[PDB]
Amino acid sequence: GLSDGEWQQVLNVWGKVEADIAGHGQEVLIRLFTGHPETLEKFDEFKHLKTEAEMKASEDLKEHGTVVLTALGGILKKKGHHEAELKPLAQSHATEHKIPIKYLEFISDAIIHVLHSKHPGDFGADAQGAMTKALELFRNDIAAKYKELGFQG
């Protein structure tokens, strides 16, 4: 439900993330976990890293942030034709990891935050509108799969 000009926007600003996906993904994860400590509890391997400084000191956490943003970038480059990518994600997060949909809301907000934090003055208002629509589309399509499963919610 984005226009082509909106998708262009999304994928242009995503180039800034690709310049250093690990650093971006670490920062996303930290924003999520520090703003919403209940999210950290879902990660058995990270749940002992309760503070920003502890999180930052883990290459394992940074590599998971790398996994997360690489997955999301591949989905964004499908410009909404992402059923096959998003299916397994929704299903593992509902059924295996037990992630309520509001945690996808929190990580979408965290991405917007981290874009402005790392690129102050370079994440323009048109780009924030288009990225926000792309994250909404992502989490909306995951929410429809959660609803099939009856998970949550």
Ligand code: HEM
């Ligand atoms: C942009 C949104 C997200 C993306 C693209 C994403 C992607 C991934 C990927 C690729 C994996 C590994 C494969 C899999 O198990 O499906 C994974 C695992 C996992 N995700 Fe997510 N994730 C997202 C959001 C979240 C959120 C919001 C949480 C909770 C706050 C979460 C919790 C987990 C957990 C607990 C695992 C298993 C980690 C482990 O023990 O190795 N995810 N995620």
